[PDB]
Structure formats: C-alpha cells, structure tokens
Amino acid sequence: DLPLDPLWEFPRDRLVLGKPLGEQVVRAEAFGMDPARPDQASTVAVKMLKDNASDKDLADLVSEMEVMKLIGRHKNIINLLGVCTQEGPLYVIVECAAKGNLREFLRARRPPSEGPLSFPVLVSCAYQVARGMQYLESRKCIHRDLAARNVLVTEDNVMKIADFGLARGVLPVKWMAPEALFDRVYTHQSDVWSFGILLWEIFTLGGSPYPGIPVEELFSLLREGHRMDRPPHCPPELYGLMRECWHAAPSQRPTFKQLVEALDKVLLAV
Ligand SMILES: *CCC(=O)Nc1cc(F)cc(Cl)c1Nc1ncc(OCc2c(Cl)c(OC)cc(OC)c2Cl)cn1
C-alpha cells in the first residue's frame, strides 16, 4: 500500500494510543520522539481512519500527511512528528497542545474585574499567529479557515495554527473575506481578513463575531462598508489593524509580513 519514508516512519510498537480527542483523532504516548533520549515518552495526537472510511478518505489523509511533510516545521504551527504506514493502519502523528484551542483558552480566562490575561499576553497571542501564518504563506499554504477555534495553545502558552493541510473534508461565513463568500476565491489576502476577525476574538476573550446579526444580514452589512465595532478595552492601534484587515479590496489589506511588524512594534513599545 503506502511506501516507507525513511525520514518520517516511527515504530508502531513505540506508540501507546490513549483517550479519543474527537470522532478519529486519539491522544497517545510516543516513546522516542527525541532521538537524543529515545526512552523518553511524550504526549502526541494521532489522526487515523475509522472502519467505514472509503478509498477517497485514505487519499485525503495521505494528502494531509504529504502536505505537512513538505511545509516543514515552525514554532507556531502544529508540527508533524512521524507516521506509521507499514503492516497496519495509517497513523499521522502531530504535536498535542495541552491547553486546547485559543477560543476556549480565552473564554475560560474571562474574569468575573481584571483577569490573568494582560494586554502584552493578548498582543503576544496575535503576534505568534501572525508569525505562524507568515511561515505557511512562505511555504505557499493558504489556510482558508483561520479562526481562534483552529489555533491551539501549548503548556507554555505558545500559539500553534491547526489544520493548515486539509483536503476537501468537513460554512464559517463570519470569518470569510468577501471575495471568498461571493466569488469562492481564497488567497493569502483572504486569510488576512480572517486574521482581522481572529484579532477581534482575542480582544473579546473569545467573543462570537457580529453579535446577534443573522448570517442573512452579514453580506449586505459588509457591502454597505459596515464592520464590527471596537471591543470594550481594545486600544485604538489594535482596532486600526483589525480595520486594515477588513478593507474590501484585498490588495489594500496588510501582508502577514506587515502584521508581524505592526504587532512587533506594539510589544516593543511595552
Ligand atoms: C495534548 C493533550 C490534550 O488532551 N490536548 C487537548 C485537549 C483538548 F480537550 C482539546 C485539544 Cl484541541 C487538545 N489539544 C490538541 N488536540 C488535537 C491536536 O492535534 C489534532 C491535529 C491537528 Cl491540530 C493537525 O493540524 C496540523 C493535524 C492533525 O493530524 C494530521 C491532527 Cl490529529 C493537537 N492538540
């Protein structure tokens, strides 16, 4: 079936599968993800197919594995760690971020008063996602569904972009740039629009975008040149970034390079 890639194959017998994470992806213990200390265990996540999967379902998982191999590694993406391809079911092994997705992370750290999430820390979350996206962009990866739910948080509060390698497998209208919504055109610039929405998620501590506004009314609100209002405590400089991300014309929005530089300047100024 699948060929042995010497650069990624990991011994099936050295991975002990554990609790499911959603329906399949499973929590596992891998022994020897560090070649330096190959007795050392680490917690990872394993994507595999359920028993009623078609030949097309295999093809899609192979395709995600092969795409992640080629994009390579970065501090701010969920990285490929290894694969089990031989004499058994296909396992794709990736980093497991202990604190879950950025949405639930922020929503659980909502104060009743001041909360344990400072301005610098929130800007830091935004900067780390911009760095992640600038990398994926340099590897010619268009995400297409950048949102706080698709950003995971490690034990050391590092941001890692999830699911940047999906094929055509299971819309989030509120996060989509107009050219996506209307023309089904996805570019790096349309990802910049989604970044602007994510900025707003961060500075509402995981708020739901366009509060109360049925999806039917969003399209005509955007065509009329209306956008989400500045969130309660959001400094203007940050709202200004969000707005730039929400320019109708894609060529008018910032590049991920410019977002990294802008957020860098805010953190240096602190
Ligand atoms: C690590 C321990 C743990 O339980 N972590 C939890 C717990 C939880 F309730 C929610 C989450 Cl999101 C996590 N973290 C976590 N879950 C899954 C995960 O990997 C899934 C995955 C991703 Cl994000 C990507 O993106 C590149 C690809 C693949 O497979 C190709 C998978 Cl399986 C990471 N962290």
Tab-separated table of C-alpha atoms and ligand atoms in Angstrom:
chain	number	residue	atom	x	y	z
A	1	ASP	CA	0.000	0.000	0.000
A	2	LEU	CA	1.919	3.094	1.327
A	3	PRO	CA	5.717	3.351	0.764
A	4	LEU	CA	8.174	3.637	3.745
A	5	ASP	CA	9.522	7.239	4.020
A	6	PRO	CA	12.739	6.841	5.960
A	7	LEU	CA	12.520	10.382	7.172
A	8	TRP	CA	9.205	10.053	8.958
A	9	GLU	CA	8.359	6.408	9.699
A	10	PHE	CA	8.076	5.851	13.513
A	11	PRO	CA	7.842	2.380	15.147
A	12	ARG	CA	4.136	1.349	15.561
A	13	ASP	CA	5.149	-0.669	18.709
A	14	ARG	CA	6.649	2.541	20.292
A	15	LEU	CA	3.238	4.412	20.249
A	16	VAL	CA	0.653	3.551	23.026
A	17	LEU	CA	-2.772	5.009	21.942
A	18	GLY	CA	-4.990	6.551	24.717
A	19	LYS	CA	-8.208	8.670	25.104
A	20	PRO	CA	-10.023	9.828	21.898
A	21	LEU	CA	-9.954	13.632	21.165
A	22	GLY	CA	-12.832	13.645	18.563
A	23	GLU	CA	-14.727	11.424	16.010
A	24	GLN	CA	-10.816	9.712	14.545
A	25	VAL	CA	-8.023	11.569	16.463
A	26	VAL	CA	-6.551	9.860	19.618
A	27	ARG	CA	-4.287	11.043	22.475
A	28	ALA	CA	-1.169	8.735	22.530
A	29	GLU	CA	2.158	8.280	24.395
A	30	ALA	CA	5.116	8.073	21.928
A	31	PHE	CA	8.424	6.660	23.319
A	32	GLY	CA	11.429	8.130	21.436
A	33	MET	CA	10.133	11.279	19.622
A	34	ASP	CA	13.517	12.666	20.891
A	35	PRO	CA	16.257	10.575	19.176
A	36	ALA	CA	18.706	12.054	21.808
A	37	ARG	CA	16.738	10.411	24.727
A	38	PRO	CA	14.829	7.548	22.994
A	39	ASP	CA	13.330	6.072	26.252
A	40	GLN	CA	11.672	9.495	26.976
A	41	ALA	CA	7.843	9.480	26.479
A	42	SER	CA	5.810	12.465	25.150
A	43	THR	CA	2.028	13.027	24.664
A	44	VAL	CA	1.068	13.375	20.946
A	45	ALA	CA	-2.114	13.352	18.820
A	46	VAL	CA	-2.675	10.628	16.154
A	47	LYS	CA	-5.016	11.026	13.129
A	48	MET	CA	-6.302	7.657	11.734
A	49	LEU	CA	-9.346	6.457	9.657
A	50	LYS	CA	-12.480	4.817	11.215
A	51	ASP	CA	-13.515	1.338	9.905
A	52	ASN	CA	-16.204	2.653	7.434
A	53	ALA	CA	-13.762	5.006	5.538
A	54	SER	CA	-13.626	4.897	1.659
A	55	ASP	CA	-10.526	4.807	-0.656
A	56	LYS	CA	-11.046	8.619	-1.110
A	57	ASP	CA	-10.860	9.010	2.744
A	58	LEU	CA	-7.401	7.259	2.711
A	59	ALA	CA	-6.286	9.507	-0.241
A	60	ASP	CA	-7.269	12.669	1.767
A	61	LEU	CA	-5.276	11.603	4.904
A	62	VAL	CA	-2.197	10.623	2.757
A	63	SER	CA	-2.550	14.078	1.095
A	64	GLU	CA	-2.636	15.874	4.515
A	65	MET	CA	0.463	13.854	5.681
A	66	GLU	CA	2.391	14.613	2.414
A	67	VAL	CA	1.450	18.357	2.568
A	68	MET	CA	2.641	18.638	6.229
A	69	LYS	CA	5.973	16.902	5.310
A	70	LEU	CA	6.599	19.499	2.565
A	71	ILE	CA	5.620	22.686	4.527
A	72	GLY	CA	8.232	21.751	7.234
A	73	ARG	CA	8.386	22.936	10.833
A	74	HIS	CA	7.701	26.157	12.712
A	75	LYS	CA	7.303	27.164	16.413
A	76	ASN	CA	3.737	28.452	15.638
A	77	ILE	CA	2.153	25.517	13.694
A	78	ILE	CA	1.028	22.030	14.903
A	79	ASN	CA	4.037	20.027	13.577
A	80	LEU	CA	4.201	16.518	12.008
A	81	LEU	CA	6.292	14.263	14.346
A	82	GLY	CA	6.104	10.918	12.439
A	83	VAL	CA	3.945	8.322	10.580
A	84	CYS	CA	3.074	4.572	10.769
A	85	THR	CA	2.480	3.452	7.120
A	86	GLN	CA	3.562	-0.246	7.129
A	87	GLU	CA	1.846	-3.594	8.038
A	88	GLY	CA	-1.056	-1.852	9.873
A	89	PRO	CA	-3.452	1.152	9.766
A	90	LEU	CA	-2.178	4.624	8.641
A	91	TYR	CA	-1.277	6.818	11.675
A	92	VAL	CA	-0.283	10.516	11.234
A	93	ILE	CA	1.370	11.747	14.499
A	94	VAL	CA	1.448	15.509	15.383
A	95	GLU	CA	2.166	17.780	18.426
A	96	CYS	CA	-0.575	17.726	21.150
A	97	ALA	CA	-1.136	21.253	22.649
A	98	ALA	CA	-2.122	20.745	26.337
A	99	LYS	CA	-4.455	23.818	26.782
A	100	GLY	CA	-6.754	23.149	23.765
A	101	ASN	CA	-7.908	25.789	21.225
A	102	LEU	CA	-7.410	29.578	21.583
A	103	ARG	CA	-11.209	30.262	21.772
A	104	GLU	CA	-11.838	28.016	24.865
A	105	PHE	CA	-8.456	29.164	26.294
A	106	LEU	CA	-9.554	32.872	26.355
A	107	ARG	CA	-13.219	32.112	27.363
A	108	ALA	CA	-12.024	30.130	30.464
A	109	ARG	CA	-9.684	33.060	31.475
A	110	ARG	CA	-12.585	35.628	31.459
A	111	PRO	CA	-12.598	37.422	34.805
A	112	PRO	CA	-15.815	37.699	36.780
A	113	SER	CA	-12.635	42.867	37.300
A	114	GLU	CA	-9.030	42.374	35.961
A	115	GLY	CA	-8.233	38.862	34.585
A	116	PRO	CA	-4.947	36.878	34.386
A	117	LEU	CA	-4.682	37.773	30.597
A	118	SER	CA	-2.692	41.072	30.285
A	119	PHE	CA	-2.572	43.278	27.116
A	120	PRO	CA	1.063	42.158	26.398
A	121	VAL	CA	-0.021	38.445	26.587
A	122	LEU	CA	-3.011	39.064	24.221
A	123	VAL	CA	-0.813	41.015	21.690
A	124	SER	CA	1.715	38.103	22.067
A	125	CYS	CA	-1.046	35.563	21.022
A	126	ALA	CA	-1.834	37.743	17.947
A	127	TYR	CA	1.931	38.142	17.067
A	128	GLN	CA	2.525	34.328	17.335
A	129	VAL	CA	-0.444	33.583	14.977
A	130	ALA	CA	0.848	36.280	12.511
A	131	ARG	CA	4.339	34.563	12.639
A	132	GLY	CA	2.712	31.127	12.017
A	133	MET	CA	0.699	32.487	9.046
A	134	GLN	CA	3.768	34.323	7.554
A	135	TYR	CA	5.591	30.939	7.627
A	136	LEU	CA	2.679	28.956	5.999
A	137	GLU	CA	2.446	31.770	3.398
A	138	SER	CA	6.237	31.383	2.647
A	139	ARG	CA	5.539	27.626	2.106
A	140	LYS	CA	2.657	28.567	-0.318
A	141	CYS	CA	-0.052	27.307	2.156
A	142	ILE	CA	-3.463	29.140	2.075
A	143	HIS	CA	-5.246	28.143	5.365
A	144	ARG	CA	-8.864	29.080	4.304
A	145	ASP	CA	-10.381	28.748	7.858
A	146	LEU	CA	-8.147	30.839	10.193
A	147	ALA	CA	-10.180	31.328	13.438
A	148	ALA	CA	-9.436	31.120	17.224
A	149	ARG	CA	-11.011	27.561	17.172
A	150	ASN	CA	-8.229	26.460	14.686
A	151	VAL	CA	-5.385	27.875	16.876
A	152	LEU	CA	-4.164	25.589	19.721
A	153	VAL	CA	-2.246	26.638	22.900
A	154	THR	CA	0.700	24.636	24.440
A	155	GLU	CA	1.606	24.191	28.173
A	156	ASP	CA	3.954	27.267	27.757
A	157	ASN	CA	1.206	29.458	26.090
A	158	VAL	CA	2.762	29.125	22.554
A	159	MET	CA	0.197	29.534	19.689
A	160	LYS	CA	0.108	26.736	17.038
A	161	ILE	CA	-2.111	27.010	13.910
A	162	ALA	CA	-4.131	23.767	13.448
A	163	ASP	CA	-5.493	22.062	10.302
A	164	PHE	CA	-3.421	24.047	7.687
A	165	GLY	CA	-3.166	20.914	5.440
A	166	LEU	CA	-6.824	19.681	4.985
A	167	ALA	CA	-8.028	18.384	1.537
A	168	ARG	CA	-11.865	18.623	0.891
A	169	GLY	CA	-13.305	17.202	4.188
A	170	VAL	CA	-15.706	18.585	6.899
A	171	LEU	CA	-19.701	27.147	6.498
A	172	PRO	CA	-17.901	29.682	8.780
A	173	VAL	CA	-19.268	32.745	6.852
A	174	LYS	CA	-18.282	35.218	9.599
A	175	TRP	CA	-14.557	34.567	9.168
A	176	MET	CA	-14.591	34.654	5.301
A	177	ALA	CA	-13.356	37.619	3.216
A	178	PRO	CA	-15.963	38.950	0.765
A	179	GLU	CA	-14.156	37.521	-2.346
A	180	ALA	CA	-14.397	34.086	-0.615
A	181	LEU	CA	-18.044	34.496	0.330
A	182	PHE	CA	-19.162	35.702	-3.022
A	183	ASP	CA	-16.594	34.512	-5.585
A	184	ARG	CA	-15.285	31.350	-3.814
A	185	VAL	CA	-11.755	32.885	-4.324
A	186	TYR	CA	-9.341	32.074	-1.402
A	187	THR	CA	-5.900	33.823	-1.299
A	188	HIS	CA	-3.311	34.814	1.363
A	189	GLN	CA	-5.124	38.140	1.419
A	190	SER	CA	-8.442	36.438	2.252
A	191	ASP	CA	-6.555	34.725	5.172
A	192	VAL	CA	-5.581	38.332	6.266
A	193	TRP	CA	-9.321	39.132	6.511
A	194	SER	CA	-9.771	36.018	8.747
A	195	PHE	CA	-6.777	37.182	10.877
A	196	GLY	CA	-8.620	40.522	11.493
A	197	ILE	CA	-11.669	38.530	12.767
A	198	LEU	CA	-9.297	36.447	14.981
A	199	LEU	CA	-7.738	39.689	16.412
A	200	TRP	CA	-11.315	40.661	17.488
A	201	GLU	CA	-11.825	37.154	19.027
A	202	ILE	CA	-8.612	37.695	21.062
A	203	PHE	CA	-9.604	41.185	22.364
A	204	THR	CA	-13.172	39.976	23.260
A	205	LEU	CA	-11.604	36.946	25.082
A	206	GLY	CA	-13.212	34.531	22.569
A	207	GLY	CA	-16.348	36.531	21.692
A	208	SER	CA	-18.699	35.416	18.847
A	209	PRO	CA	-18.297	37.762	15.801
A	210	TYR	CA	-21.169	40.044	14.539
A	211	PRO	CA	-23.098	39.572	17.826
A	212	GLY	CA	-26.803	38.678	17.191
A	213	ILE	CA	-26.706	39.565	13.427
A	214	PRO	CA	-28.241	36.646	11.428
A	215	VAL	CA	-25.866	35.306	8.654
A	216	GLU	CA	-28.518	36.588	6.131
A	217	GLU	CA	-27.767	40.269	7.136
A	218	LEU	CA	-23.896	39.993	7.221
A	219	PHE	CA	-23.392	40.084	3.385
A	220	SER	CA	-25.366	43.365	2.958
A	221	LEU	CA	-23.712	44.904	6.110
A	222	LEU	CA	-20.224	44.276	4.567
A	223	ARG	CA	-21.250	45.627	1.095
A	224	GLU	CA	-22.508	48.807	2.905
A	225	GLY	CA	-18.990	49.318	4.399
A	226	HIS	CA	-20.013	48.272	7.981
A	227	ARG	CA	-17.571	46.303	10.242
A	228	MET	CA	-17.513	45.089	13.913
A	229	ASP	CA	-17.147	47.988	16.439
A	230	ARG	CA	-14.007	48.410	18.643
A	231	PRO	CA	-14.319	45.944	21.576
A	232	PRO	CA	-14.638	47.464	25.083
A	233	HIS	CA	-10.957	47.745	26.231
A	234	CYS	CA	-9.158	47.269	22.812
A	235	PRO	CA	-6.602	50.096	22.276
A	236	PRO	CA	-7.167	52.076	19.035
A	237	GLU	CA	-3.948	50.930	17.419
A	238	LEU	CA	-5.218	47.411	17.567
A	239	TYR	CA	-8.669	48.215	16.264
A	240	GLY	CA	-6.900	50.071	13.438
A	241	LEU	CA	-5.086	46.812	12.498
A	242	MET	CA	-8.429	44.883	12.525
A	243	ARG	CA	-9.964	47.557	10.211
A	244	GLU	CA	-6.979	47.372	7.765
A	245	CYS	CA	-7.545	43.554	7.617
A	246	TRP	CA	-11.234	44.330	6.697
A	247	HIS	CA	-10.569	46.636	3.664
A	248	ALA	CA	-12.924	45.410	0.860
A	249	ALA	CA	-10.008	45.411	-1.683
A	250	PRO	CA	-7.602	42.505	-0.887
A	251	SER	CA	-4.615	44.482	-2.143
A	252	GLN	CA	-5.439	47.096	0.435
A	253	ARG	CA	-5.106	44.806	3.398
A	254	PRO	CA	-1.789	44.307	5.199
A	255	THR	CA	0.535	41.370	4.321
A	256	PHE	CA	1.332	38.855	7.134
A	257	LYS	CA	4.831	40.425	6.987
A	258	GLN	CA	3.273	43.884	7.798
A	259	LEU	CA	1.026	42.377	10.571
A	260	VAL	CA	4.115	40.740	12.229
A	261	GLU	CA	5.948	44.152	12.046
A	262	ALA	CA	2.890	46.098	13.375
A	263	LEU	CA	2.320	43.712	16.364
A	264	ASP	CA	6.133	43.628	16.983
A	265	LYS	CA	6.066	47.468	17.356
A	266	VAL	CA	3.229	47.301	19.980
A	267	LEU	CA	5.155	44.672	22.055
A	268	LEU	CA	8.465	46.658	21.753
A	269	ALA	CA	6.600	49.853	22.864
A	270	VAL	CA	5.578	47.881	26.032
B	1	LIG	C1	-2.161	17.051	24.399
B	1	LIG	C2	-3.224	16.712	25.380
B	1	LIG	C3	-4.652	17.044	25.153
B	1	LIG	O1	-5.568	16.367	25.630
B	1	LIG	N1	-4.875	18.134	24.391
B	1	LIG	C4	-6.117	18.687	24.007
B	1	LIG	C5	-7.268	18.532	24.794
B	1	LIG	C6	-8.451	19.091	24.368
B	1	LIG	F1	-9.560	18.937	25.141
B	1	LIG	C7	-8.559	19.803	23.197
B	1	LIG	C8	-7.432	19.961	22.415
B	1	LIG	CL1	-7.552	20.869	20.940
B	1	LIG	C9	-6.213	19.408	22.807
B	1	LIG	N2	-5.067	19.567	22.001
B	1	LIG	C10	-4.812	19.065	20.763
B	1	LIG	N3	-5.768	18.312	20.178
B	1	LIG	C11	-5.502	17.847	18.956
B	1	LIG	C12	-4.306	18.130	18.326
B	1	LIG	O2	-3.991	17.664	17.070
B	1	LIG	C13	-5.037	17.468	16.106
B	1	LIG	C14	-4.435	17.561	14.729
B	1	LIG	C15	-4.066	18.795	14.193
B	1	LIG	CL2	-4.350	20.235	15.114
B	1	LIG	C16	-3.481	18.896	12.932
B	1	LIG	O3	-3.160	20.133	12.456
B	1	LIG	C17	-1.926	20.294	11.761
B	1	LIG	C18	-3.278	17.751	12.181
B	1	LIG	C19	-3.622	16.509	12.695
B	1	LIG	O4	-3.421	15.340	12.021
B	1	LIG	C20	-2.911	15.407	10.691
B	1	LIG	C21	-4.194	16.423	13.961
B	1	LIG	CL3	-4.600	14.858	14.585
B	1	LIG	C22	-3.378	18.902	18.993
B	1	LIG	N4	-3.619	19.377	20.217
